[PDB]
């Protein structure tokens, strides 16, 4: 639903902070992915090759529980129990 490019300056061993502005969220599940790729071609790989990525849960979903009002039928014989609902028979 949303993609954005960035550049970060960090020398060997350095830790740097990255700030991501989040949208307003509904009852769905939301995951964030952060990746780093080759800016231009190398002798061993092409521009856009991913070298590193990580993923994080932003928000768990809200589960819905619905009350069913429609009916189910049941027929017994000597070997089988048969259960009918809508247009499926178990």
């Amino acid at each position: 639903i949303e993609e954005k490019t960035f550049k970060i300056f960090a020398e060997p061993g350095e830790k740097r902070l990255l700030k991501i502005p989040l949208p307003e969220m509904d009852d769905s599940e939301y995951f964030l992915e952060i990746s780093f790729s080759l800016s231009e071609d190398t002798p061993w790989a092409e521009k856009g090759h991913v070298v590193a990525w990580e993923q994080f849960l932003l928000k768990a979903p809200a589960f819905e529980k619905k009350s069913i009002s429609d009916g189910v039928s049941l027929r017994e014989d000597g070997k089988h129990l048969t259960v009918e609902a809508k247009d499926t028979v178990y």
């Binding site: 017994e76 014989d77 000597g78 070997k79």
Partner: protein, 180 residues
């Protein structure tokens, strides 16, 4: 080689020690019958589950199948009456019965099924009863059952394993008169 599975703690005998006979059935006949009962959760109303296996040995014409239920009182009811083409098939039926008399060792009420396919006639005695395990307890028609039993060998001091009906009846009456 059969003798290796017949090593019971008993006398080793031999011979034709039970009855021999010849009988004749129509070309299209009932080979086998399986009658089972169920009872509801109040042990009040019953169901009959009937499997009838038919066998054809060169018949061509269609025959009439009738199944009649006779109650312990003596009343009769037709459960099935249909025409069947001659073939090897298992027919299955399920019937409901209201407040049947239940079979127990204390009260042995027997119903009769009468089955007739053309000129072939057979009868089977059956009872309404249910054995089950609920939470490790043994139940018979919904009540806790205590087995007050004995082991019996089919043995006679004059005839060996060839025991008669008169002796079988003597054994049963003696068992019941001693609370077995």
């Amino acid at each position: 080689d059969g003798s290796y599975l017949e090593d019971q703690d008993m006398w080793w005998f031999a011979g034709i020690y039970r009855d021999v006979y010849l009988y004749a059935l129509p070309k299209f006949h009932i080979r086998d019958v399986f009658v089972r009962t169920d009872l509801d959760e109040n042990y009040r109303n019953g169901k009959i589950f009937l499997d009838v296996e038919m066998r054809n040995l060169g018949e061509e014409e269609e025959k009439d199948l009738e199944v009649t239920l006779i109650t312990p009182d003596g009343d009769e009811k037709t459960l099935v009456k249909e025409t069947v083409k001659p073939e090897d098939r298992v027919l299955s039926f399920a019937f409901d019965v209201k407040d049947p008399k239940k079979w127990s060792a204390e009260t042995p009420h027997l119903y009769v099924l009468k089955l007739k396919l053309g000129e072939d006639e057979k009868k089977v005695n059956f009872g309404f009863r249910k054995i089950e395990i609920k939470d490790g307890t043994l139940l018979f028609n919904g009540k806790p059952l205590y087995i007050k039993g004995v082991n019996r060998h089919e043995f006679d001091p004059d005839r060996g394993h060839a025991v008669t009906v008169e002796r079988m009846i003597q054994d049963i009456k003696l068992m019941k008169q001693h609370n077995i």
